[PDB]
A = this chain, B = another copy of it.
């Protein structure tokens, strides 16, 4: 007689490759700065303000400061570099199936 079917299928952030594999090198003679900045951030915020009130959704952010007032090198700065990576690879199947299936009804 009477039927009500409600299939509210919510879905987010699925099978999502966000990671970052990375060889990072840093060879300075003098005083340098390297900043690698990769905050992988996944979120799902739901804010329902049904009557009076407040939603102060204030997540903090990244803050990277490098301050240096005085900095001296009163003589020679040398850096004699032969090599860094002497890799001798003398010898690949990556079947990366990311499957999803909704065979409904």
- The answer to whether A42 touches B16, judged by C-beta atoms less than 8 angstroms apart, is yes
Copies in the assembly, this chain: 10
Also in contact, A57 and B47, with CB within 8 A (given A26-B34, A28-B27): yes
CB contacts (< 8 Å) of A54 on chain B: these are 49, 53-56
- The answer to whether B12 touches A15, judged by C-beta atoms less than 8 angstroms apart, is no
CB contacts (< 8 Å) of A88 on chain B: these are 87-90
Main DSSP-derived SS at the A contact region: loop
CB contacts (< 8 Å) of A98 on chain B: these are 15, 96-99
- The answer to whether A68 touches B65, judged by C-beta atoms less than 8 angstroms apart, is no
Which chain A residues in 5-32 approach chain B with CB under 8 Å?
5-32
Also in contact, A41 and B42, with CB within 8 A (given A29-B29, A30-B30, A78-B77): yes
- The answer to whether A35 touches B8, judged by C-beta atoms less than 8 angstroms apart, is no
Which chain A residues in 60-105 approach chain B with CB under 8 Å?
60-105
- The answer to whether A47 touches B36, judged by C-beta atoms less than 8 angstroms apart, is no
Q: CA A70 – CA B23 in complex, angstroms?
A: 32
